[PDB]
Coordinates of N, CA and C and ligand atoms in Angstrom, one line a residue:
X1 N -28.7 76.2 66.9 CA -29.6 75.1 66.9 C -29.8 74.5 65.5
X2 N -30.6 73.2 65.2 CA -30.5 72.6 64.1 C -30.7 71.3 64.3
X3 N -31.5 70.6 62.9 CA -31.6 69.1 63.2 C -31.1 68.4 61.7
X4 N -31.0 67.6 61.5 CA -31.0 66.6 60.4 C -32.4 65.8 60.4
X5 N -33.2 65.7 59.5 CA -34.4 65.0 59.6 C -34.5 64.2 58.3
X6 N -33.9 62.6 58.3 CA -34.0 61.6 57.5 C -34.4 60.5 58.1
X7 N -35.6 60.5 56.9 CA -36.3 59.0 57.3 C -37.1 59.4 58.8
X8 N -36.6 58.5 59.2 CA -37.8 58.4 60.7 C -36.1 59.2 61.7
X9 N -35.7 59.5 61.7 CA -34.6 60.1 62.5 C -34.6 61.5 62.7
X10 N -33.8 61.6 63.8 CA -33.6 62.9 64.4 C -32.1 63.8 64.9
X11 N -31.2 64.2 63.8 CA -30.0 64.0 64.0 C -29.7 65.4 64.7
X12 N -28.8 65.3 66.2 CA -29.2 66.8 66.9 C -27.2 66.9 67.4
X13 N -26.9 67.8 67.6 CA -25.8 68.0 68.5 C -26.4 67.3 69.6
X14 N -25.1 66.2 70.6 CA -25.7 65.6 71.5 C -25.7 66.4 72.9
X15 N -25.0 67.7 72.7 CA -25.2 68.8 74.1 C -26.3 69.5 73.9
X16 N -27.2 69.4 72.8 CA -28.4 70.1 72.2 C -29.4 68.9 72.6
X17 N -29.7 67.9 73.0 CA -30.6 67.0 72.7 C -31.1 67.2 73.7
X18 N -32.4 67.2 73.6 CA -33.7 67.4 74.7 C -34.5 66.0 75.3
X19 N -34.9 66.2 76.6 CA -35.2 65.3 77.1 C -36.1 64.3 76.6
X20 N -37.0 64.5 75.6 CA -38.0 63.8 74.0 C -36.4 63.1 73.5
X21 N -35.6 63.8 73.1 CA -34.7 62.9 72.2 C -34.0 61.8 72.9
X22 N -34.0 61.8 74.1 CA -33.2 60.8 74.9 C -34.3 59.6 75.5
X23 N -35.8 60.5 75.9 CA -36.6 59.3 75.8 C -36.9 58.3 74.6
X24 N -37.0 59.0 73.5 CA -36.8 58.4 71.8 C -35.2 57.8 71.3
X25 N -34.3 57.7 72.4 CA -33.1 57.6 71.7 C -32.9 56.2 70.6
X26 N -31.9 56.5 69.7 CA -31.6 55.6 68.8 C -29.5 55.5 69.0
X27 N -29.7 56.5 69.4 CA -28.1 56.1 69.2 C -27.2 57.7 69.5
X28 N -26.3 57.3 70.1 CA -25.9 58.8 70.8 C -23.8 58.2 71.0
X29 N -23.0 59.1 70.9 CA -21.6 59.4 71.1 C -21.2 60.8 71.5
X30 N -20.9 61.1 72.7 CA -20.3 62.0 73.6 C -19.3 62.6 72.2
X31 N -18.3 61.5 72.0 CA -17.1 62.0 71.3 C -17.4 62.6 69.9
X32 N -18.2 62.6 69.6 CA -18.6 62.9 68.1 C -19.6 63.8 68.5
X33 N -20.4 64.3 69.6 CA -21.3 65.3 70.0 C -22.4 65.2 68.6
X34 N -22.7 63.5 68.8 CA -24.0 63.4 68.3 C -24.9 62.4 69.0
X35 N -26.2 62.8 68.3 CA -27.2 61.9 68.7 C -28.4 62.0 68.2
X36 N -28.9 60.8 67.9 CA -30.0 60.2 67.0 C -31.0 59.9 67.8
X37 N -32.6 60.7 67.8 CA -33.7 59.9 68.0 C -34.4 59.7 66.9
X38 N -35.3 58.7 67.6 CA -36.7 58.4 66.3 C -37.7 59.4 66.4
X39 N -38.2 59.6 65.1 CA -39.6 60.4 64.9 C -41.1 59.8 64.3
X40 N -42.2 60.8 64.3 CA -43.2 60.2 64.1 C -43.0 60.6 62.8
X41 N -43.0 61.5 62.2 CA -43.3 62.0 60.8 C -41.9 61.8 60.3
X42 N -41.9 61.5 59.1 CA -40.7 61.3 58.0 C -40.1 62.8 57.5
X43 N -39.0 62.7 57.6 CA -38.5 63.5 56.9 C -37.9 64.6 55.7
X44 N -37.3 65.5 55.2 CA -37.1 65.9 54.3 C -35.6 65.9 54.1
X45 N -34.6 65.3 54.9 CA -32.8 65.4 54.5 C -32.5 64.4 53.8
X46 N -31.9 64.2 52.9 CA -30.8 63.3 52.1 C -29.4 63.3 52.7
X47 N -28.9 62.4 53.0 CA -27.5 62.0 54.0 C -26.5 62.2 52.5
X48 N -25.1 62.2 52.2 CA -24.7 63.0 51.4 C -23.8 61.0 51.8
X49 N -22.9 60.2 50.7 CA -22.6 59.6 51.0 C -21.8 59.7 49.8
X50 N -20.5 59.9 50.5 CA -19.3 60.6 49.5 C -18.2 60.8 50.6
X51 N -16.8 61.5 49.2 CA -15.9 61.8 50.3 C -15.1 63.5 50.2
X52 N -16.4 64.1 49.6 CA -16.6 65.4 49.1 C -16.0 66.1 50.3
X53 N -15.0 67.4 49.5 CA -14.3 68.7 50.7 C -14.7 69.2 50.0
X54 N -15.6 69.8 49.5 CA -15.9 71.2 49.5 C -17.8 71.2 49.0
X55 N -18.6 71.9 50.1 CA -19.8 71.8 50.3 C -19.9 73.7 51.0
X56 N -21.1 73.5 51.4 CA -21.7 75.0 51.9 C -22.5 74.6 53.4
X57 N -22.4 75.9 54.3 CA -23.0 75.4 55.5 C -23.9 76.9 55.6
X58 N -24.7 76.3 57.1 CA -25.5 77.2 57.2 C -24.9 78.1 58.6
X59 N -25.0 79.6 58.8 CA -24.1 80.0 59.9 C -25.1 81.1 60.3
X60 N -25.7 80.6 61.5 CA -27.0 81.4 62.1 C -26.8 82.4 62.5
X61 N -25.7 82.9 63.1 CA -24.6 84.2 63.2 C -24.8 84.8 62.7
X62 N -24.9 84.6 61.3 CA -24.8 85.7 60.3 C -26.0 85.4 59.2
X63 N -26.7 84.8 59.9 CA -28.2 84.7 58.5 C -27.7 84.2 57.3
X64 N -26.5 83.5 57.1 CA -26.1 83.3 56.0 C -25.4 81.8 55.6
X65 N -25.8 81.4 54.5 CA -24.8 80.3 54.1 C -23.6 80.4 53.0
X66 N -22.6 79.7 53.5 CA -21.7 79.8 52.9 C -20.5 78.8 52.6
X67 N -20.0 79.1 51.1 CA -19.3 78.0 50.4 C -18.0 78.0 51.0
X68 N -17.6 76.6 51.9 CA -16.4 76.1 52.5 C -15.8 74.7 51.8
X69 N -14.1 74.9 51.9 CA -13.6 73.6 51.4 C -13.4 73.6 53.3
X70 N -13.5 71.8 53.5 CA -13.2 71.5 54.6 C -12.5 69.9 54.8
X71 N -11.9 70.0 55.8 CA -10.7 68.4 56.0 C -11.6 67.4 56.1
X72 N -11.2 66.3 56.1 CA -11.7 64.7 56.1 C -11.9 64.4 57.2
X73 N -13.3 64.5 57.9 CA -13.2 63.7 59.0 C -12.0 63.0 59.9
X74 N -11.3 63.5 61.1 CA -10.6 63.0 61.9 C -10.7 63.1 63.1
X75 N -10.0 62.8 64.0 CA -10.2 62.7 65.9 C -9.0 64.2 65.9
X76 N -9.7 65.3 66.2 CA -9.0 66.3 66.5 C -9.1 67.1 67.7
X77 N -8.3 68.2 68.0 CA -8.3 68.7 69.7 C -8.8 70.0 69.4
X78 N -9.8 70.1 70.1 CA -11.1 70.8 70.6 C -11.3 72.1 71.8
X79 N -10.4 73.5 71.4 CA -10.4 74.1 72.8 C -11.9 74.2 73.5
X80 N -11.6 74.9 74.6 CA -13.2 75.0 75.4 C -13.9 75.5 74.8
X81 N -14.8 75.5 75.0 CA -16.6 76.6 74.5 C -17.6 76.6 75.7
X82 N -18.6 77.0 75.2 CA -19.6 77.6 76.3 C -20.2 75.7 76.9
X83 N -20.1 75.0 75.8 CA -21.0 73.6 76.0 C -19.9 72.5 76.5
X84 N -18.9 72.2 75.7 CA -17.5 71.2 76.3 C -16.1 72.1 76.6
X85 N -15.7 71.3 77.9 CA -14.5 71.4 77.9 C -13.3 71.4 76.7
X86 N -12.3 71.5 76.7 CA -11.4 71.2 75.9 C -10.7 69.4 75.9
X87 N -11.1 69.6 75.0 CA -11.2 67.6 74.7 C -10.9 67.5 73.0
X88 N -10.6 66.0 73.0 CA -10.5 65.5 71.7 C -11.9 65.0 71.1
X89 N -12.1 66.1 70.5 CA -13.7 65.0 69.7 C -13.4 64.4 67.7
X90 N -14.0 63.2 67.8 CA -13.8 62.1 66.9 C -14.5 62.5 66.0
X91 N -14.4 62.7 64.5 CA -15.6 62.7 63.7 C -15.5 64.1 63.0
X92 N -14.8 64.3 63.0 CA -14.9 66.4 63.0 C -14.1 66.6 62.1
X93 N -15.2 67.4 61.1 CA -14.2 68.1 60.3 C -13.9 69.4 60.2
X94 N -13.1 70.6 59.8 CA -13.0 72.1 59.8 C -12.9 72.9 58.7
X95 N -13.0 73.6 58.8 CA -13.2 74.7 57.5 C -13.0 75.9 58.1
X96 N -12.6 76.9 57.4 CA -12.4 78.8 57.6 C -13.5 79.2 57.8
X97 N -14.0 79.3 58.7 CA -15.3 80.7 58.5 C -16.2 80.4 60.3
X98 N -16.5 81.7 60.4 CA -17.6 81.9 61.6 C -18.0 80.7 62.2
X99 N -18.1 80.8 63.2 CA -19.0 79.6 64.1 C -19.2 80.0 65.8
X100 N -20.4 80.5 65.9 CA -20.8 80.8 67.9 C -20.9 79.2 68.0
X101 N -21.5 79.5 69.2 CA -22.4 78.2 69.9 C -23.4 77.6 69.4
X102 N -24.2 78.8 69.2 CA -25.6 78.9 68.8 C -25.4 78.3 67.4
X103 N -24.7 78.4 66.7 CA -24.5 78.0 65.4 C -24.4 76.5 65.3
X104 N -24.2 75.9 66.8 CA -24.2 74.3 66.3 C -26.0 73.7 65.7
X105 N -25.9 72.9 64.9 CA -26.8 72.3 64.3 C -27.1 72.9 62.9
X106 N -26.5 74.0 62.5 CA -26.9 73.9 61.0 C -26.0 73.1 60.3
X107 N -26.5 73.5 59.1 CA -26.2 72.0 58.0 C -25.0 72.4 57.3
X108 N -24.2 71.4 57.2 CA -23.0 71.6 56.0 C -23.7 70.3 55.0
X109 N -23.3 70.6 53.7 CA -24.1 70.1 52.6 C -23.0 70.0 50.9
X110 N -23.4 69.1 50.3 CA -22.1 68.9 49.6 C -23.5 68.4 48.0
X111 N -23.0 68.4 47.2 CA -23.7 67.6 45.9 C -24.9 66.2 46.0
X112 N -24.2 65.6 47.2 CA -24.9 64.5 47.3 C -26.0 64.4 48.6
X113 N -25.8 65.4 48.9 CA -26.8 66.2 50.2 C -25.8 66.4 51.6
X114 N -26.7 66.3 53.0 CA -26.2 66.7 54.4 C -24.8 65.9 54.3
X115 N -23.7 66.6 54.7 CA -22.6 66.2 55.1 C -22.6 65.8 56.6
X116 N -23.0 67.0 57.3 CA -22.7 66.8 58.8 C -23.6 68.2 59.5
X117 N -23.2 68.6 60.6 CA -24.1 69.9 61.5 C -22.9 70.3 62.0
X118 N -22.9 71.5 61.9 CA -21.9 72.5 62.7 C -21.8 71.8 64.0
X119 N -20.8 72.1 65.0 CA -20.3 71.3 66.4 C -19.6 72.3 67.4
X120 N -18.4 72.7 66.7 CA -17.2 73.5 67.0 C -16.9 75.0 66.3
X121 N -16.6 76.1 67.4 CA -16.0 76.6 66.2 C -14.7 77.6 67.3
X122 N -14.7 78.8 67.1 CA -13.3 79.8 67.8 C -12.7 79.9 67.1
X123 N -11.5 80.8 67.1 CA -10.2 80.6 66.0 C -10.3 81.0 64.8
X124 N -11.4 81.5 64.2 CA -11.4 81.6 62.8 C -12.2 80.1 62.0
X125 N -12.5 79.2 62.9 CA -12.6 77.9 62.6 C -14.4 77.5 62.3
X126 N -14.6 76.5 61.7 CA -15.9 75.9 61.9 C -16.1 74.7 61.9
X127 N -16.3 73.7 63.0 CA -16.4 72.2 62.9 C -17.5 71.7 62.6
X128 N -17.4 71.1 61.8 CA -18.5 70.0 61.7 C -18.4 68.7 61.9
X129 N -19.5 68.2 63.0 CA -19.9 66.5 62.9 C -20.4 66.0 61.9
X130 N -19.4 65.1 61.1 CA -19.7 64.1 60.2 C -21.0 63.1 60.3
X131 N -21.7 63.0 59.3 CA -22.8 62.2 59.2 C -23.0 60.8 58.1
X132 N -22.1 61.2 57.3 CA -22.2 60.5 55.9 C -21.3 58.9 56.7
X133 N -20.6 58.5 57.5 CA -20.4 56.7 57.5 C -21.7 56.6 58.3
X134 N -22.6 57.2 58.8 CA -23.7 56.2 59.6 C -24.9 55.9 58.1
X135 N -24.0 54.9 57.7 CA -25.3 54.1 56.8 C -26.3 53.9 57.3
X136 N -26.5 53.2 58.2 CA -27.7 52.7 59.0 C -28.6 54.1 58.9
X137 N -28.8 55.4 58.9 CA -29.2 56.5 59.0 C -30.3 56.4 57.8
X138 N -29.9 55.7 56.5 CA -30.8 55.3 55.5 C -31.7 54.5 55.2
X139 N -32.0 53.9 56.3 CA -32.8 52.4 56.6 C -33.4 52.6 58.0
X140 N -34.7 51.7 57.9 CA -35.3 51.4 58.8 C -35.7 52.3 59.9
Ligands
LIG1 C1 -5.9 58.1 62.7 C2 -7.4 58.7 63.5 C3 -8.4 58.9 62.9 C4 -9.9 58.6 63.1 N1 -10.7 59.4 62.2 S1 -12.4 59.5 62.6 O1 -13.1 58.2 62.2 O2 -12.9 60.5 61.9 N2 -12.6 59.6 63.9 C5 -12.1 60.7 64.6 C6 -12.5 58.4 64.5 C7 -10.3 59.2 60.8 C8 -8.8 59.5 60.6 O3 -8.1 58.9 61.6
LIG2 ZN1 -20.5 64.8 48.4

């Protein structure tokens, strides 16, 4: 579990989003397994707005964060997990290290802040949903 909290936003894995976040929705994609509500209180995240590979994430698995280089955001293929089928999801980037289920929604984080939230993992792998092209995320 895990959120992103910038500005008046609420950034959640979209198989994690609770029935508040879909009454509050702002903006939601299946394929990118995100989704944005509004909040009452402001937040404490910085959106990372860069084209940085190499940041640190957070991996609830193991109580631990840790320093990963990871790929450039692309539309890649996705085996099953406990939450989606095996599908192509858009937005995702990977890195070597740990990742359950439970692990979706911590932070991967680079110099210029939040990169993205854990999404995917198996295989030795860790996915992350990209956050840094939703400018709009910064405003209003
Ligand atoms: C040639 C396909 C993809 C699309 N991606 S993407 O925006 O990260 N996304 C999955 C749409 C970037 C790289 O190229
Ligand atoms: Zn960066």
């Amino acid at each position: 579990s895990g959120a992103i909290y910038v500005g008046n936003y609420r950034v959640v894995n979209r198989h994690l989003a609770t029935h508040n976040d879909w009454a509050n929705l702002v903006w939601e994609d299946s394929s990118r397994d995100l989704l944005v509500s509004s909040t009452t209180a402001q937040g404490c995240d910085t959106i990372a707005r860069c084209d940085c590979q190499t940041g640190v994430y957070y991996c609830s698995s193991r109580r631990k964060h840790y320093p990963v280089s990871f790929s450039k955001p692309s539309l890649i293929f996705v085996e099953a997990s406990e939450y989606y089928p095996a599908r192509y999801q858009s937005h995702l980037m990977l890195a070597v290290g740990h990742s359950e289920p439970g692990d979706c929604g911590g932070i991967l984080r680079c110099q210029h802040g939040v990169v993205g939230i854990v999404s995917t993992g198996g295989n030795g792998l860790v996915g992350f949903a990209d956050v840094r092209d939703l400018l709009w995320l910064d405003e209003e």
